[model samples]
Target: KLSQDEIDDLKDVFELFDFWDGRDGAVDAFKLGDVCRCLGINPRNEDVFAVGGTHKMGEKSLPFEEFLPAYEGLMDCEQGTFADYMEAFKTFDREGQGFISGAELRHVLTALGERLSDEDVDEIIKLTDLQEDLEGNVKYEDFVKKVMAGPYPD
Candidate 1:
C-alpha cells in the first residue's frame, strides 16, 4: 500500500532506533510513533500505536518484523479525522509548539509521500484553507479541521 521510498524510510528509521549505542537493540511504542511520523504516516488511534509495542514484543520490545506490519496498516488505513491528522502533524512539531512551520507542512506535502502531481498536493493546501499566521506556521489542530471537513467530510 506504499512505495519503496516509504519502505526505505521505515527501515532507516527503524534501524536508527533499533541500532543504538553501537549495539543492536529494540524500541518502544514511542519510538514506533517516531518511525511512522518521520514517514508522514500516522497511527489511527492510541491502540494502534500501542500495538507497535505489544503486537509481538512479548517483552514490550519492538522489532522490524512488528514495525513492518504496523506501518503497512498505517499506510492501508485512511485516517482523515481531526485528531488523527493532528497526530500526523505531531511528527513535524518536534518542539510541541502546538503548531508547525508552514515550510515544514508544505515540504511534507510536496516532497514526501509519493510523487504526485503538484495540483494534487495543491488541492490539499488550498482545500484545507490553512490561513497560516505571520510566522508562516500552522495551528495543526485548526488546520486539521479543514482536512477533516473539506477533503474527507462525510
Candidate 2:
C-alpha cells in the first residue's frame, strides 16, 4: 500500500508526463520508460513490465491503470540512500558499462524534470568527472562516493 503523500507524488509524476489524454488515461512505451528512469528503476527489466500488466512483446502502449501498480513497485525505496542513488545511477548508465556519459547524465536529469542549460550540464560534468578519464564520463564508484559525501536534504 502507498501513503496519500506517495500517491500524490505519483499523480504529480503522471501529470509531469501529461499521461492523461481525453480518453481513458494511457501512456506509451516511451513515457513508461521515462517514468522508470525518473524513478531510478531500469525500464529494460522484465519485472517492470510484469508488474505493470500484460501486454504483447511488441505492444506500444499501456493503460495508466495498468501502469500504476508497477509505478508503486518501482518507487519502493528510501528517498536518499546510497542504494537509492546507486539505482538511479545504474538507470542513467543505460549501457551498463559502469559509468555515466555526459549525454546520459543530461538525459537522466531531464527525465527527472530538470531543465538545465548546456553550460549547466557542462558544469555538472566538470564537477563529477574527477578522473578526467573520459571526455564526459564519470565512473560509477566515483559518483557514488562523491554524492554520498555531500549533505543530502531530507
Candidate 3:
C-alpha cells in the first residue's frame, strides 16, 4: 500500500538506523521506535503494534516484512491534520478518556525515538496548557485545538 517512493524512503530510514540484520530483515524494538519517529508517529501507539503484528513475535524482534505493513498503515493517514493529531493523541489517551496524564505524555514523547529532556517535556506541557489543575492531566479537546492552531513542528 505504499508508493515506490515511500518504500524507498522507508528503506533509507531503515538503513540509517541500521535496522536490518541483513539475513531475514529483522529489527529490534529500538529500531521500530526509530521508524515510528521517522514516520512522525508516537511509538507507543497500539496501531504500531497492531500493524507490525508484534503480538506474533512474543517480545522478539520484528521482521521488516511485518513492520512495513504497519508503516504503510500510518502513511495512509493525512499528516498534520486535526484528525491525524487526534489519532496520535488517542494513542496515549488510552481508555478513550479524552485526556492523558503528564506522565503518559512523557512516556510517549520519550518513546518517540528522541531523547526529550525533562525540560522539553515540561515546556511542551506548559505550552499546551496540558495541566490546568494540580492533577496534571491534558484534555484532548484542548490539545487538539492548540495543536491545530499552530505552526506545527517540522
Candidate 4:
C-alpha cells in the first residue's frame, strides 16, 4: 500500500544505513528493526520479524531487494477500522451493552480471530485499558478509539 514516494523515503533510509557497511548494497540484519522504528514505525508493537528472516532464508545481510518486501508488508498489515472492531466486539458485548467485561475481552483475544496467547492478550490489555468499572464491565468504545491510536510507545 505504499506509494512510490513513501517507498522512496524508505529507500533513502536504507541507503543511509548502508553507508555504515562500507557503502555496500546491504546492511546488517540488526539494523532492519531499528531502521524501521527510528523512521517512526512504533517498535513497541510486534509485527516485525526481520528483513531476510521472513522467508526463512537467514541471509546474513539485508539486501535492498529483500528489504523492500518485508518493510511494505509489515507497514501494510491488515488492521480493521474502528467500526469494524466495534462490530466484532459487539458480538461479545452481550445485550447491546456497548461494552464488554475484561474477562470477555481477554477471552476474545485469546480464543478467536488471530487467537493470541494469554501473554499476548495480557500485553495488549496492558497497552490499552485494563480498567473496568466496579461491576467488572468496561466501555470498549475506548478500546475502539484506542485501536486508532495503535503502535505508540510510552
Candidate 5:
C-alpha cells in the first residue's frame, strides 16, 4: 500500500485526458502497465487469464474519464497523474491503439509477473470498456482511460 504522501507525489507523473471531455489532450503517454512496473505490481504470472470485450462489456472500452478512477483502485497502491497514466497507456500500446483487448492486456500484465484468469481479463475489459478504431482495434484514448481505472481483482 502507498502512503497518502506517496500517492500525492504520483500526481506529478500523471497526464490529464485531453482528447475528449474538457481535458484538452492533457492526457500523457504513459500507460497503467508502466505504472504497475514502477510500483512493482505485475498482473501476469501464469495465474492470470483473459476476459471482457465488446461481447462482454457491451461497449468499446472505458474512456479516459473512467480510466483515472480505475487505476486508483488497484491494490491501494500509489496514485499517478493524468499525464503519467497517459504515458503509461501509450507505453503499453506501442501500436497506438487506444484500447487493449483481453489477450493483449493479459500479455502486458504478464510482463510484470501478474496473473489473471479469463474472467479476470474480462473484468478488466469490462472495466475499461475497451474500444476499437476503423481497423476494429483498440484506440489509445480509450486504452489509457481503462488502465487509469486500474485492474479489478475479484
Candidate 6:
C-alpha cells in the first residue's frame, strides 16, 4: 500500500497527466511553448524548439497510421467480434482490477515504451465504457460481452 504522501505524489502526476492528456477538454491545451516553459528551456532556441515541439512522451503525436497499428496490436481479438474484443479486455486488464484506469493503462503502455496522454487514455477507457466502472475494476467476461454487443464499426 502507498502512504498518503505517495498517493498524493501520484495524484500530482495525474494532474500533469490530465493536462498533457487533455481528456476532459475538446482542445489540446498542451503546446510547445507550455512544455518548454515547464522544462525551463528557451523556446526560441532552434535546437530546443525542435526537441520541445517535436518531443512526445506518449502516443500524443503519433501519426494515426502508426497509432492505429499499435492500437490494433493491443487487441488480440478480431474487430466486430465479441470473443476477440473480450480477449483484449482480459489481456490488457491487468491487476484484475475490473476496469482499466488511465493510469493503469498508461503503465502498461509505458512498459511497452509507448505512452498516451491522459485524455487519450480516458477516451480509450470510455470507448469501452470501462470508465463507468469507477472503481477501475472491470470484469473480463462482462467487458467482452459489452463490446461484442455494441455496434462496432465495420
By TM-score, the better pick of 1 and 6 is 1
Stretches of model 4 off by over 4 angstroms after superposition: 1-5, 8-62, 73-78, 151-154
Candidate 3: 10-residue stretch with minimal lDDT = 49-58
User: So what's the TM-score on candidate 3?
Assistant: 0.45
Residue by residue across 1-154, what tens digits does model 4's lDDT show? 7788988788899998888765889867666765775555643234655334332223467888787776765665544567787888888878896878778888877777555689866787777755788888888887767756766834
Question: What overall lDDT, based on C-alpha atoms, would model 1 receive against the true structure?
Answer: 0.67
Q: Write the per-residue lDDT of candidate 1 for residues 1-154, one digit (tens) a residue.
A: 6677867777888877776522355666555665676666655445365455443333466668777887677666665666666777897898887888877777776776544457875787787767688877878777766654544457
Q: After superposition, how far is residue 80 of candidate 4 from its true place, in Å?
A: 1.4
Q: Where does model 6 exceed 4 Å of error?
A: 1-102, 110-113, 132-134, 140-154
Top candidate (TM-score): 4
Q: Ranking by lDDT, best first?
A: 4, 1, 3, 2, 5, 6
Against the true structure, what is each candidate's TM-score?
Answer: 0.43, 0.44, 0.45, 0.60, 0.35, 0.28
Q: By lDDT, who's the top model here?
A: 4
In terms of lDDT, model 5 sits at: 0.48
Worst 10 residues of 1 by lDDT: 50-59
Superposition-based RMSD of candidate 4 using all C-alpha atoms, in angstroms? 5.7
lDDT of 5 by residue, 25-114 (tens): 233323433333445444321211121112221233444344335445554544456787677657766566456554555666555433
Go through the candidates in order and give the C-alpha RMSD of each one to the true structure.
13.2, 9.4, 8.2, 5.7, 16.1, 17.4
Report lDDT (CA) for all predictions. Answer: 0.67, 0.60, 0.64, 0.70, 0.48, 0.44
lDDT of 4: 0.70
Reference-based lDDT, residue 45, model 5: 16
lDDT for 4 (candidate 6): 63
Candidate 3 Cα RMSD (Å): 8.2
